[model samples]
Target chain A: EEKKRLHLIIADAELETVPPEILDHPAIVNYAKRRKKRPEKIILDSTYHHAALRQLEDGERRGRPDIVHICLLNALDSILNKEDRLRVYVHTRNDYVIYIKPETRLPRNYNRFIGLMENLFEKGAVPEDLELLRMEKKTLNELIEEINPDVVFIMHEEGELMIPKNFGKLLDKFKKPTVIVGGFPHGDFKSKVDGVKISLYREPLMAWTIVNEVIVSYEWEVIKKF
Target chain B: EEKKRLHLIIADAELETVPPEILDHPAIVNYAKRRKKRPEKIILDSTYHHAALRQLEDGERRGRPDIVHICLLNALDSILNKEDRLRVYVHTRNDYVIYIKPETRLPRNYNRFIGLMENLFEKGAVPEDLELLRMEKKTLNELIEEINPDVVFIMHEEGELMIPKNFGKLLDKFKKPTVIVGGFPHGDFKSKVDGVKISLYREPLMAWTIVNEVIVSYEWEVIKKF
Candidate 1:
């Protein structure tokens, strides 16, 4: 018996503590002052550090922890996860894959999410015993192969263009299918994946949006059999 | 000549400062004390106030400012809004409707969104010279009449199971089409919306998911005329 589930990989997610190199930057320094926290302890945010981000290579497409947070909230809250039919993993730029348990409810407040990440990074797993969330060294392709799915479809703007409804129907055909999207604010997948690239909209959509549409449209089709 | 635009109403959105009646409730008092803010100033969150919300009428589905924040973020960050082809309104449980201008950039931080709203509600208009966000006391039906559209479609679980692609086609039939949705965690339209009830899927999906489907599906069809 094969598992009928969806595996979403937020590959190469640009999440990390503000790097030590940029800690002395004026934006991080001023932001740290306002936040009354150590510059190195703060999460990188493209919004707060747009000016300072220019100081780093590929900085324009990084510092988007909000995208990761929004994507998780959308999937975790899905009807799929509530039924124990979904799993979400985040592979950060530093090659740490964070595993999130479906039943785990995350903080809705962004700052609380930041706090949780800091602790998660510190503890390697949260709540010590429950271990609802655990982070460890894992490569994106390594994570995908671990799933051992029949096929993989990575959503990207430059990928296959087809009606999303058609895409959902296509998803239903595979017992174990994975969809990959790399629109983490225009950053390409850091690791090579053995999958076809899928585009939900031709005009380009927000990263959080592709997350919802990918899950919702697939969930929309997957439920008809029930 | 009709305008090719979309207007969405989050009817009966359960958003406001923590009510006075619940200010004394243990949950609110504790939540407020922890934040060190006046009880009346904090935004009501059902996640935190689930225990105390029972004190209010129809409270089970109330205290969901997060829904409002998510819905707006979805629409405001939309490709449709970027081209000035969209407008969003939030009709509160208290019968106050908030008008969001297309280009207004909302804070992604939920705390910042709440902090913005506290002052936003205080003055009834924000960024005064721009008046980007404004509130007016308008009944749901009255507001609909003001739009005076060729038709209306209100999304609800019990509505017709119309495929969103086809639904978007129906939206195109009208010169001015308005989509109505309630923004509470779980609630019915306070007003008996005189329009077709549409459901994108059979199972209950999150409010923001519905927002994405409605706007994305509609906007997907909007640009074909050229």
Candidate 2:
């Protein structure tokens, strides 16, 4: 039997608005508890700041990208597949690497998810129940050395190869493969992590959508043996 | 040269909350004037009810889906590709059909998008510049009859065939083809509109993700020989 490891990295994510007080904020914590059906830890919302709220309200008017939070949501959402064989990481713009343990359950509710993230930010620690890690101020190179993937590919609109052409090759050519996608709403990857740039389409696509493509493509390869 | 028409339909969308005062509402109208970068029609948000807001707040916790609006945004965003050749439609639970004209551009902002929808609902008419139509009290069958597509697909979690296998065939089979996806949070089609059911994955996917798959597959077929 052949085993493979897939790493999906979200670089320069925009989830910095949450204040440290968020963990202790009664309004948010109560809301999370009520929503998650659990009276445990507190949760927070991403629109916790004046600027983010305004940007969300005037997103189209101001050409703001409110995609960061949803991107994470959708990315985690896709991993719910029972057949998934990937390790996911979030490399924040603020210089931190959050690692998701395989078989780690993610929060289905957005509020709880936000709360969990805030709690991690405040405590700088991962909950024991959840198989996740929050490593502070880590660089892209450190992650590369740690994972030691067999091959690496970065998703970019300007890349020379289409996903359809490149996806299967990655699966067959290497037992450990890593794929990087932008976590922010727009623009290019901020870090200098180098890899084979793979383009899904000629047009720029949302990060979550790209995550879907990657998941489906991987599933097809696994099931179809193509 | 062969031509194909793709119609992306969003059924029973959750955007039924626009109050009648949206058009004349000074806050929204002035905002549109200041932002359109030109004089234009008014716009509004989707969640006018407290229940809807609460549901959004508790969405992840409650396992509610908030994908309707984002699905539309992503579908429109993909058309930014100069090579797209598809028609888009919205069939609401209220028994109305929204037909988007090919050249009738959509706003990039989420707020403005919601406002435009609310404004349309309030006016009960599509603006001439918009190239959009809001046909009230219409049935899905009537829209089907009007378009009379050569092929149709209803997206479901339990569809008979996977999308990658079926997409290009649709492109080759019909001059006009339509794909239907749920616009509301969850569950099956509220009304019976029949077609070959298509499933992208074993697990149910968000509406916007399906939109992305459809757009990318179509683009690939047109750009790259299957």
Candidate 3:
């Protein structure tokens, strides 16, 4: 019944290198010195840059690249992906999008994961030859139109509540469907896009948790048929 | 329908510090030098100790504290845990059991997580005053008997195939149920655990993926009512 794979887009993810405002900050300088990398090239993580992040606006929700790190590990490692039925994209708050191939094996080590991201951000593609992964400046709205999805499901806590299993069924109902889930730690999405807001649980679940549930649930509905 | 919380036991987890056999290995020595910790206190991570791991038996399977690291982050960060409906334990292959409180917030950074484990392994308990996380010697069998679960579900790929949502219903069928999932990478359990083997997917899903699916499914069945 399905001819196309589900396009899973993590929307408004909080992934970015250190901003220009905090590049000269003491905490950034100390962290950069320790890693021996320029401050602008490294990913901003709340754990390492908590002190410096405190001085920025929307500090609490901004610097959580680990959200993307953990979410991708779950998504890329799912049965749905192995069956070649899933496609994942990351639309960051700063209007950057990371296109990930299903076969890309991400580094399991968090530090190594950071290094990989640093390389990807700097070169716009890692291994520039294969281009398995490439990032570009693109807004969330532009991405949705590019996909031209028949339907887009935006995963939001305050949206209409539905069991995750049924949400899986809804994915197969539309051709070229896309879903957007916030990748930040503790806030609503930064970008505004039009789509059906679907809520699996009444309370807010972590982004990676929702990512895993959605993929596995969709696996049951679609991949099992294959 | 449920009278007791689920006892999620990650059995035979490959979480341990560098063994005495490879403590003096150059790979470990260099790692210790960089970490500024005694080789004995640091956890065995494959990324930093790949060369030294090759010298040990079952080299591929051992030295994966990240399995435990990523798994716990997914488990403790779930809605089931926040609702006080779940209890988690890490039973290592070396027979060391880590009792984790539901309220404990783990370090988000891999380095900080490694440091926390080093501290816990050195001293029996972290923050000696609170003892939020404490590790002690105990086999998988001992932990099972301690819980005296009405039933135990062992999650394995070769086990009985069932939808993850139904596995959630199975948990509530018994009081004080325990689930044993392999915490190692690419291998079977070292300890012979006796229980009903349950498989959510036909193929092997990573340890952390299974952890997230099981916890989220259970939350749907149990927490939704509350």
Per-residue lDDT of B12-40 in model 1, one digit per residue for the tens?
89888787788899988888887788888
Q: Write the per-residue lDDT of candidate 3 for residues A162-205, one digit (tens) a residue.
A: 77777888887777889888988777888988889998788878
Q: DockQ score of candidate 2? A: 0.09
Fill in the DockQ of model 3: 0.52
Which 10 successive residues of model 3 chain A have the least lDDT summed?
Answer: A217-226
DockQ of each: 0.29, 0.09, 0.52
> Across residues A1-226, which tens digit of lDDT does each residue of candidate 1 receive?
2557888888888888887778899989998997788888788888778888886877888788877887888788776676566788888988888998878888865767888887888788998999999999988878887888888988888888866657877988888888776536775677786788888667767777777666756765776533
How do the predictions measure up, each by TM-score? 0.79, 0.70, 0.92
Q: What share of the true interface contacts does candidate 3 keep?
A: 0.50
- Docking outcome class, model 3: medium
Off-target runs (Cα >4 Å) in candidate 1 are A1-4, A18-62, A79-86, A127-130, A169-175, A192-194, A202-204, B1-4, B18-63, B79-85, B159-173, B199-203, B216-226
> Clashes per prediction?
2, 10, 0
Best by TM-score: 3
Per-prediction fnat: 0.21, 0.00, 0.50
Error of 3 at A51 (Å): 2.6
Residue pairs in candidate 3 whose N, alpha carbon or C atoms collide under 3 angstroms: none
Docking class of 1: acceptable
